[PDB]
Amino acid sequence: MNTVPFTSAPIEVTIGIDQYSFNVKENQPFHGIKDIPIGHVHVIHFQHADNSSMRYGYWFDCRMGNFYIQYDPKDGLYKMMEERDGAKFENIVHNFKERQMMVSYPKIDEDDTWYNLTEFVQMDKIRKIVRKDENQFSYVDSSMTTVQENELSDPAHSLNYTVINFKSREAIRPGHEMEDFLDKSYYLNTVMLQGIFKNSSNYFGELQFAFLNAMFFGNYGSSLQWHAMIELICSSATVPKHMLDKLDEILYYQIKTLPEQYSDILLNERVWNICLYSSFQKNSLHNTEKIMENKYPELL
Amino acid sequence: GAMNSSNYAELFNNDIKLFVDDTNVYRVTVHKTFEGNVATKAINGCIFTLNPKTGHLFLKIIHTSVWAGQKRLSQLAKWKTAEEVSALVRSLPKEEQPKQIIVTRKAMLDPLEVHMLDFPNIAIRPTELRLPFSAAMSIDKLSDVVMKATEPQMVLFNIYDDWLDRISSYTAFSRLTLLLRALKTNEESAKMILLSDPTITIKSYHLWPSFTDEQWITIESQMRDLILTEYGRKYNV
Ligand SMILES: Cc1ccc(C(C)(C)CN(C)CC(N)=O)cc1
Secondary structure: OEEEEEOOOOOOEEEEEOOEEEEEOOOOOOOEEEEEOOOOOEEEEEEEOOOOOOOEEEEEOHHHOEEEEEEEOOOOEEEEEEEOOHHHHHHHHHHHHHOOOOEEOOOOOOOOHHHHHHOOOOHHHHHHHOOOOOOOOEEEEOOOOEHHHHHOOOHHHOEOOOOOOOOOOOOOOOOOHHHHHHOOHHHHHHHHHHHHHOOHHHHHHHHHHHHHHHHHHOOHHHHHHHHHHHHHHHOOOOOOHHHHHHHHHHHHHHHHHOOHHHHHHHOOHHHHHHHHHHOHHHHOOHHHHHHHHHHOOOOO | OOEOOOOHHHHHOOOOEEEEEOOOOOEEEEEEOOOOOEEEEEEOEEEEEEOOOOOEEEEEEEOHHHHOOOOOHHHHHHHHHHHHHHHHHHHOOHHHOOOEEEEOOHHHHHHHHHHOOOOOOOEEEOEOOOOOHHHHHHOHHHHHHHHHOOOOEEEEEEOOOOHHHOOOHHHHHHHHHHHHHHHHHOHHHHHHHHHOOOOOOOOOOOOOOOOOHHHHHHHHHHHHHHHHHHHHHHHOO
16 A cells, blocks of 8 residues: 655645545645555546636556655646655655554445546556656646647647547548448557557557546546547447447446536537447447436436 | 528639539439338439539439449438549549539538548538529439430530620529529429520520520519419418
């Protein structure tokens, strides 16, 4: 079980860790988060009390270093940093744990939610979508645009998700225009899976990371990416049976975890109705269809 | 964006553009089978591709053989249209290719955009106009060449005959759309009007009679009366 200490919490802020949150008063003693499960990526995220504009946060994996949070009063945000001195870090953490000023990552033992949301998400892939190679952790916020968004303006601060565009030469073979537009299997299986992602695990990892950035930061381009990767599968007549079964599980847990009051914005009516009721895979997403109908019957 | 009443003069500027109408591509007769079920029999169709400035009509005849053994024909018809328009554009010299293609039905947008991916600088546009190009098959010589075709066949005409020698393309297009609207609302009356006077003939390579300027005004007047009348007989006013 690993720890991310906080130097101090000088401004009032809602702090998130994965699907959990702690509401902190100006200079209240929130000095860290302890007992963080090893083996998964995690995200620590922030929403300032005084300016709910800009949710932002850091993707990290405690196996890759000792990380802490420190407020920067010049840039006005909580920054993740790496501590390279291991003895300094263990000493800082042990003091904070003795004063009991670190909250415990509040995982219920029965609860596989985070695993199910991050099953295929790896830090190494995250760091290629979020390019900042001097750090082992990755910053994301509400306003960052995607590469494809920038094509339609600061590249260093972009989300380099895989560009998916259904009316593109990449998606459509010359001479198979109608065939490839109405059944995207070629684009999914040959162009994207075999060509670009290499396997379905990397595809699912990007899909899950896109969802999580949409949910935790309201990042609009991430939401577009998530829906596009769903739609590409559902619009393919030929999908490996293991991918469909896993997709149904993935989406089930994403829909389960979505805040009920954010469904209006984060869920695209057209993609979901098409995937669940019109597409080739209309009959292949039983878990997802059942939770969607029982939780968001209005959208449908 | 979409083409409508407001940006109507753009049709007659010097940027090459084509209207594409697919309403007559897939055509059927519906009939009863010996078992008392219903079946369709396809008949030859055509793509109606028109330069509104010049009157040049690229009439691609769609022979019934292109449907043999195919499913979802109404959907295929839109992609076949898009394939044929794309092929026509590629066959034209660069300086003759359109800068815009306006489709008369919104369901043609995605099929045409996909077939024209190689032409990113050609804008594919819908229109808010309810244009009467479906009535092209009420023009006798166009209907004749379509029904007689035994193979796929590209056929041409200046749908304005020689009118541009005397009138502008705005006026020629207005005349055309009035004639076609009339033929669509009441073909029998419309054709009666156009042919009532045996002394006015159709030149061999013309689709319409050789009216003088004065006779065209009379004709155009009669076509309006018909359109308002039929609208009368339809709504009871
Ligand atoms: C928002 C929030 C802020 C602070 C905390 C503490 C863990 C410090 C609370 N401690 C129990 C106080 C102490 N004296 O140890 C928890 C949650």
